[PDB]
């Protein structure tokens, strides 16, 4: 799609390979199918389905779509930078002292039985 090239133009990336637009459009189709599918399930849920209790009539307001998307981003879609979590977590790590030692001009390795000894693997 030419409009996908137009959207590429926003990020200064005019060097595509022409498989990307097919692929990303396929992707968005898949994604929105799933989205407005489970939103339709939730529109059914407000319409109180089981093995025969009532009908199924579709409106699909925006709230249902919002629900169907928040569930997806519950386990996907790299969220806002979780800075505070990382700050406190890293303060918990950044708490116990350095070793304050001298291996005296070499490399200090972990002890063997934590080192690997990359021999030819064998039974």
């Amino acid at each position: 799609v030419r409009l996908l090239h137009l959207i590429f133009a926003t990020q200064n990336i005019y060097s595509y390979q022409d498989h990307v637009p097919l692929q990303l459009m396929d992707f968005a189709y898949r994604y929105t199918t799933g989205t407005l599918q489970d939103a339709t399930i939730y529109s059914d849920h407000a319409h109180a389905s089981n093995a025969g209790n009532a009908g199924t009539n579709a409106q699909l307001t925006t709230e249902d779509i919002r629900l169907a998307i928040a569930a997806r981003t519950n386990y996907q879609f790299k969220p806002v930078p979780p800075k505070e979590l990382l700050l406190e977590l890293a303060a918990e790590r950044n708490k116990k002292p350095l070793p304050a030692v001298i291996p005296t001009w070499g490399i200090r390795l972990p002890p063997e039985k934590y080192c690997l000894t990359g021999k030819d693997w064998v039974l």
Binding site: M25, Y29, T33, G34, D120, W121, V122, L123
Partner: protein
């Protein structure tokens, strides 16, 4: 048992369809070197078997499609169904 299975991989009587060179490349990619030949043939074998399983899934799901009791083509519906029945995810292609 198990020990027969590495009695057998060594000699030419059982040499997986996947050539030794290609599996060596894919061992190396994902980071494994060893101067044994058994293990590489073995991962070859397991992969051969897994693809055979999706093969039979495709065969039967094609056999259901019409006339239970211009040649055969393993299309996107057959694949959509078998890959789905696995854990392989949804294939929702499109046009326009």
């Amino acid at each position: 048992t198990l020990e027969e299975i590495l009695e057998m991989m060594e000699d030419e009587e059982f040499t997986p369809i996947i050539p030794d060179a290609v599996t060596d490349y894919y061992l190396a990619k994902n980071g494994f070197e060893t101067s044994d030949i058994k293990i590489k043939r073995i991962l070859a074998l397991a992969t051969q078997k897994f693809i055979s399983d999706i093969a039979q899934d495709a065969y039967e799901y094609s056999r259901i499609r019409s006339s239970s009791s211009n040649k055969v083509v393993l299309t996107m519906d057959d694949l959509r169904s078998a890959l789905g029945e696995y854990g392989i995810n949804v294939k929702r292609p499109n046009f326009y």
